[PDB]
């Protein structure tokens, strides 16, 4: 079964820097990792606005081919809506895509793997993990 | 009580000696990328990707999440 | 088959005012309307932060049970990625949620039903309609 | 006070093949007859019924707060 | 006429109350999925319901307009 | 098992007129009939350009739900290419939609049902029937 | 995933002339291109009415093998139907095969690659590119 | 994930129907890269087609699209 949702940050990090520490983790957790389609959307945008789109798309393809891209569904949407209202109340600011990614993870009971970890902390009932 | 049958034929790739796999590779993980398939040694699925496949320098210096 | 994707705006407007002109469109097009899960997220958020969360969730379930909710998938994401780059090249300013809805609709050859066609216009490969 | 516990009469029924099965979020259904044919519909998917029904509060989403 | 839905032996099914029961001669049926509705037709009479109602406007394809 | 492919003419005739004789043939041959998606296209077109598109689409939905719609695939494409070439040599003139339907039926070894077998007889390897 | 639908025109343009500019295009976009089965039909007719059916078929089939052929399905047919009617109330004349190809591309949210972009610009919710 | 095996005297890798190849793909190219192998269907490169045989000169001088 799946255990981990890689956030957008750890994906930009990993792809840019190819850190061998992360290479270890991936090899160990192969088959337990996924990303939200929302994050896929960001990576696609990355390549599209870059100097070498076709090239960057191909790197992203090899990454994506190795993991699961989860469809952002009604449960993910519902968790995100609740989460947005919960943070708005408590004046904790979190970015829109991060909100959807957080919602997606929580609705599947997955651990969110981040770079910073700080922003995702403010979300209730969400387990995180730093792989950088 | 049930009748014994035959499983379906699976697809397989002959692997020439010039390009055969090390003896310590008995478990394999098959990735699809386009019409391309990648055979990796179990537990080493990510090696090929970390090796090649660099992205241009400008690639997401800014994430631009609003 | 599915024909129309109702954006978040037209939904808000429909749920608040229950207008005759829209009712007539809904009947005329029963079975052919969906929303992106991205819009469902927005509606849940609208209810949770609402003064009458209980009541409002309830009207929203009545709405959702009669129209399909499409999961925002990879193809949806890929088009949104592209759309974000197309737009930034042109300094055309469109909201993030609207951009995902636009991408979702374009990936499926769906017509966007909205009451502000003026911003979805900025996207190419996209047909819009104003149900008031 | 005392009475009897009886069995009801068997009802005419129809099986639906998997290929033409209703969704399972559907469990209650209305039926009308047209000649020797019967038409089966999931109840409470009336748009009219929903339009005429309950309202939301007036504050509801006066602002979408979609990030600039 | 309202009614309920039940699983019977690993397969969906539908009760048909007396006021809506099929004639006695209808022993087999053919179930047709038209959108969200299902149409229960006596085997051998699948088209009767469609032929009997469901009229198109009179202009409908008076002209096919195939090029050439 | 599929035996017949209804051409566009037979469908139009049936839909506009609901003839008693055709009703008997359909009832008898239920489960052995289909149309090509090429014919679907024309019917959708017919409705879309008509006085009452949604009304007319509803009637088409009824019709289509009782038959199979075959996708026009490479095999149908290949036979249509051949047929078109065989016909030019004969100098026997056929419409393009009819050519694709003929090709489609032949690729699947189906009998073309139509309301005028004249056209389709100029075509080799193809069995026709008049059900009007 | 697929990105481009090559219409019948660039196919003929590309097959008759083997242009270098286009070769570069295909090398750069290999894997992301397809044709509708409608175009296949045209190509096959082309070869079949040739003076060297033998040889010309062989070339076509080598072109196709390197390209994806999508079946013309119910969605492609529905879009085509809509498009034919959309164009009728505008008096904009597009050919039948071009219309099917347009319909097909729209249903899949594919970009029509052509050289005759003028004929496709009449069509709504469609994106084109000149690759000549 | 599959198990390396032998077939008619040599080495073989099974392809789970999830990541199967199109029924088209009959012959295949193989490349080695570290402990990893890469499979590509043969004859899908464009250069080999562009440089290859050409069509007769009359090919589709007329498209013959009706209307
Ligand atoms: Na806004
Ligand atoms: Na005709």
Numbering used by the authors:
A (entry chain E), C (entry chain C), F (entry chain A), G (entry chain G): 1 to 132
B (entry chain F): 2 to 67
D (entry chain D), E (entry chain B): 1G, 2 to 68
H (entry chain H): 2 to 68
Structure paper excerpt:
In the largest TA family, vapBC, the VapC toxin contains a PilT N-terminal (PIN) domain, which is a compact ribonuclease domain consisting of an αβ-fold harboring four highly conserved acidic residues required for catalysis. Recently, it was found that VapC (MvpT) from the Gram-negative pathogen Shigella flexneri 2a virulence plasmid pMYSH6000 functions by specifically cleaving initiator tRNAfMet in the anticodon region, thus globally down-regulating translation. In order to understand the activity, mode of inhibition, and DNA-binding properties of the VapBC family, we have determined the crystal structure of the VapBC complex from S. flexneri.
The asymmetric unit contains four copies of both VapB and VapC, for which the VapC structures are complete (residues 1–132), while the VapB structures cover residues 2–67 of the complete sequence (1–75). VapB has an N-terminal domain consisting of four β-strands (residues 1–45), which dimerizes with a neighboring VapB to form a complete DNA-binding domain, and an extended C-terminal tail (residues 46–67) that wraps around VapC (orange). The structure reveals a compact hetero-octameric assembly with two unique DNA-binding domains of the SpoVT/AbrB type that have not been previously observed in VapBC complexes. Secondly, near the C-terminus of VapB, the side chains of Arg64 and Gln66 of VapB point directly into the active site of VapC, where they make close, charged interactions to the conserved acidic active residues Asp7, Glu42, and Asp98. Mutant studies implicate metal ion 1 (right) directly in the cleavage mechanism, whereas metal ion 2 (left) is thought to stabilize the conformation of the active site and enhance substrate binding. Both ions are present in the FEN-1 structure, and comparison to VapC reveals that the positively charged guadinium group of Arg64 in VapB appears to take up the position of metal ion 1, while Gln66 may substitute metal ion.
